[PDB]
Structure formats: structure tokens, C-alpha cells
């Protein structure tokens, strides 16, 4: 069974940038090599094919070379919409083997993120548990970190993120930190913070809101 | 209009069987190889078989081979994956994808649909408005979120008035703890927007045929 054995995984580029990834084939595949791009929540889309031929309606950023072994993808010009990842596979003997893909993320400029801290929903405490919400919007680079304070006190078990593929439209991430108490222990304690230390500014941004408001 | 749809995706036990199928239309089903591939939770494509127009020749992958049956029905222009044996190894996203005409090339994928294998149970979310804090905001616009929590399986789809407020929205990947994933969306819009005028997140469970929709209003007695 063939191994597509694709490099780079991971890819950071900016706009204007010329890339070019590298599919090896554990043997011969002749010519037949396709590549594929698959944006976030979207299916596949076939670019090139035969490893050199543009599909229908490819744009001429998207070329393809190789044979034998060796094949490359390029994209000569790298747009924002290029964002996504990009896998080969082999079509000469079945099984059809993918590559592992290449995740490409987009360089652009370092940006803060707006935070917004949420008490627990109105709906939420009669159950006996109570999420305490803060959303990190539209920040850059990807890597960030936040501080739960109750009533001066960091608080790390509870603690749950979750960040968003970057966006196609403004290539920012977004994150959400969920901090997860009982009703009972988020009425015994009054102030409640999140903070953001992101490496735009020496100075955290910190959200904050008492129970009793 | 070159179109895939996938169904019979959702949640089965493990050594348990699940059948997929992928209508196609928009082009002749008869005249193309057909072939199904699938997408594990943070993993690659993995291709899982092909079969060409007649039904004469079809190929697995080696380990998919003795548990996976992939067969078509030219009459009903749709194409079937018949999933046995199936472990943890076969959650993921499944794709019917059209071979293009003269090369062994995906021409054509669906939009996927989604199979989990678990012991756990089914379990809906409940869902909850985040409105923010108690001061009335200053500023020219306002966040609003929408918590998940506490559903099994994956998928939720998640909309805001009922999909005509798109711009401004993130929503979060879903995380799993203890058999029970958490998810949450915000929305910003212009606070001459809200609350003003009424902002509504509507979430839906398939697989527990769950349709919940929360307004948002402003925090405080009414
Ligand atoms: C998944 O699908 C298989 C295959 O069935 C065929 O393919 C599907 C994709 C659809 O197009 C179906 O409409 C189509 O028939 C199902 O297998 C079928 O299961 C039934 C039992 O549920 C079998 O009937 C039995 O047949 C034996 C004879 O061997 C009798 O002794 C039994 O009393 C009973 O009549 C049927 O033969 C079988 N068909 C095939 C081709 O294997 C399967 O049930 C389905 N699985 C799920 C989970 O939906």
C-alpha cells in the first residue's frame, strides 16, 4: 500500500508569498497525482490532476508538477482566501492514498482581541451549575492566555477553551474560555475576572463583573 | 448543478453497523465511478473505496476490506456505504465523492455526513442566552453569546435569527468532557441594533431532535 508522504505539515505565509509543497510517494506513481484544497467547514475541492493539469475552473495561482516519485503543488501568488488545507493523493494503484495534508495559516498583522465576560445566563443557575463565559474576538497571532481571577484569586481547575479556525475574511482567531462553577460555589464569592495577556501589549485586557450587579 | 448528498450518518455502538447513502444528482450517476472517503476527528483524508458504474469492480482499503460493503443503485442515482464492525477508529466526517470522467480524481465531494461510535448515550443540550454584563454597555456595539452545553453527539448547528444575522458570529468548536461536548457562539452587532430590536440563537440537535431558539434581552427583572 503506498505512503503519500507530504511536507510541510504546517505552513505560515503572508499574501503575495510564493509556496510549494512537497508530496513523495513511498514508490512509483507515474503521473497520477491529484491535489486537493479543503477550506474550513467546507468539502474538498480538486485543483490539479494527472499532477500537472489544472481542473475546470482552477485559477492559474494553482500549478502542479512530478513524476515518478517527487511531485509539488505552488501556489504562485498565496491570497487570504488560500486558507486552507491542501493534501495530495495517488490515483495510479487502488488503495488511492491521501498525503496528510498541509495546514496553511495566514500571516497578517498583530491585532489585540475585544474580550466580553458573561455571567452565568439568567436560565442557567436554577440548574445548580454556572458558566462564567469570556470571548477573546478577533485577535492575532493565535496564542493567548487567560486568567480566571475570583475575588483576587486565580483560579486553573474548571477552566475549559476553545478556539476558532482562523477566518477566511480577516484572518484573526477568536477564543472562548469557559469557566464551569456550582451554582453554590459561584454564590459564595463576589468579583469575578478574566484576563487576556496577548503578546500585542505588555498589559492585560481585563473583563470583570460582580455577582451582585 | 453537479450536486452530492450524504445521509444515515449518527451515532452507533461499537461492533454495531450503520449504513450511508449519497444521492446524487445534476449528472448521469450511471456513466462515473463513485468512491467514498472519510475525515477523522483532527486527522487527514483517508480514502475508502471506489466503485466503478456497472458495479463489476470494487476496491477497499486493506483495513476497510471484510467490514465495509460499498454497492450502488444506478435506478435511484444513489450510492450506499454499509458500515459493519465498526470501532472508535471509524468516527468520523464520510464523503461520497464523484471520479472524475478519465482519471482516478475526486472531482466532485459531498458535503460529508457525520457518524460517531460510542457506548454513550444521546443526550440534548440544554442552551443558554449570554447577555452581557448588568451595566448597560457603553460603546458602539455590543457582544452577545449563546452557551451549548451538555449534548452527545456532535453535531449542534447553530444560527442567529435564524440565519439572517451571519456577519459578527463565531462559533466555537465543540469540547468533550465526560462523554458530553460544550459549545457556545457569540455575536456582535451595533447597539443601535439590540436591544432595540430582537436577537434569537437557534440551535438544533439532530440526533435528539432537539429545536431550541433563545431570545436575548437585557439582564435585570421584567
Ligand atoms: C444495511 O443494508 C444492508 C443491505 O441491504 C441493501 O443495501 C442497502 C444499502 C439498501 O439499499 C437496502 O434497501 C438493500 O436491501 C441490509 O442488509 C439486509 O438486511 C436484512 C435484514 O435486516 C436481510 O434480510 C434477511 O435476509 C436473510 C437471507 O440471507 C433472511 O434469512 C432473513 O430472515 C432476512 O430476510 C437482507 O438480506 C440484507 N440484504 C443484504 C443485501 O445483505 C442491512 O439490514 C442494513 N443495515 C442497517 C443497520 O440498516
Known amino acids: 500500500s503506498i505512503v503519500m508522504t507530504q511536507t510541510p505539515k504546517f505552513l505560515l505565509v503572508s499574501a503575495g508569498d510564493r509556496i510549494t509543497i512537497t508530496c513523495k510517494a513511498s514508490?512509483?506513481?507515474?503521473?497520477?497525482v491529484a491535489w486537493y484544497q479543503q477550506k474550513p467547514g467546507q468539502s474538498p475541492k480538486l485543483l490539479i490532476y494527472?499532477?500537472?493539469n489544472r481542473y475546470t475552473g482552477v485559477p492559474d495561482r494553482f500549478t502542479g508538477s512530478g513524476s515518478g516519485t517527487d511531485f509539488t503543488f505552488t501556489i504562485s501568488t498565496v491570497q487570504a482566501e488560500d486558507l486552507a488545507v491542501y493534501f495530495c493523493?495517488?490515483?495510479?494503484?487502488?488503495?488511492?492514498?491521501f498525503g496528510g495534508g498541509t495546514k496553511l495559516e495566514i500571516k497578517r498583522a498583530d491585532a489585540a482581541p475585544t474580550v466580553s465576560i458573561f455571567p452565568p445566563s439568567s436560565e442557567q443557575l436554577t440548574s445548580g451549575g454556572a458558566s462564567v463565559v469570556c470571548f477573546l474576538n478577533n485577535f492575532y497571532p493565535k496564542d493567548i492566555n487567560v486568567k480566571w481571577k475570583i475575588d483576587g484569586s486565580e483560579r486553573q481547575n474548571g477552566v475549559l477553551n476553545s478556539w476558532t479556525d482562523q477566518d477566511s475574511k480577516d484572518s484573526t482567531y477568536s477564543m472562548s474560555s469557559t469557566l464551569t462553577l456550582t451554582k453554590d460555589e459561584y454564590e459564595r464569592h463576589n468579583s469575578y475576572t478574566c484576563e487576556a495577556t496577548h503578546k500585542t501589549s505588555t498589559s492585560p485586557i481585563v473583563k470583570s463583573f460582580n455577582r451582585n450587579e | 448543478n453537479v450536486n452530492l448528498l450524504e445521509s444515515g450518518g449518527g451515532l452507533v455502538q461499537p461492533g454495531g453497523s450503520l449504513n450511508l447513502s449519497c444521492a446524487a444528482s445534476?449528472?448521469?450517476?450511471?456513466?462515473?465511478?463513485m468512491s467514498w472517503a472519510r475525515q477523522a476527528p483532527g486527522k487527514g483524508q483517508e480514502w475508502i473505496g471506489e466503485?466503478?458504474?456497472?458495479?463489476?469492480?470494487?476496491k477497499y482499503t486493506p483495513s476497510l476490506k471484510d467490514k465495509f460493503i460499498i454497492s450502488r443503485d444506478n435506478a435511484k442515482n444513489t450510492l450506499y456505504l454499509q458500515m459493519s464492525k465498526v470501532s472508535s477508529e471509524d468516527t468520523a466526517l464520510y464523503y461520497c465523492?464523484?471520479?472524475?470522467?478519465?482519471?482516478?480524481?475526486?472531482?466532485?465531494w459531498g458535503p460529508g455526513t457525520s457518524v460517531t461510535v460510542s457506548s454513550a448515550k444521546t443526550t440534548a443540550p440544554s442552551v443558554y442566552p449570554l447577555a452581557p454584563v448588568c451595566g448597560a454597555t457603553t460603546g458602539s456595539s455590543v457582544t452577545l453569546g449563546c452557551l451549548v452545553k451538555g449534548y452527545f453527539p456532535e453535531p449542534v448547528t447553530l444560527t442567529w435569527n435564524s440565519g439572517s444575522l451571519s456577519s459578527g458570529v463565531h462559533t466555537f468548536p465543540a469540547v468533550l468532557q465526560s462523554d458530553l461536548y460544550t459549545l457556545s457562539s457569540s455575536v456582535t452587532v451595533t447597539s443601535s441594533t439590540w436591544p432595540s430590536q430582537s436577537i434569537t440563537c437557534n440551535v438544533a440537535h439532530p440526533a435528539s431532535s432537539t429545536k431550541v431558539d433563545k431570545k436575548i434581552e437585557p439582564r435585570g427583572p421584567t
Open positions: 466503485i466503478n458504474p456497472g458495479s463489476s469492480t470494487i
Open positions: 445534476g449528472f448521469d450517476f450511471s456513466r462515473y465511478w
Open positions: 514508490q512509483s506513481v507515474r503521473n497520477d
Open positions: 494527472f499532477a500537472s
Open positions: 493523493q495517488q490515483g495510479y494503484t487502488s488503495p488511492r492514498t
Open positions: 465523492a464523484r471520479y472524475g470522467s478519465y482519471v482516478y480524481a475526486m472531482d466532485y
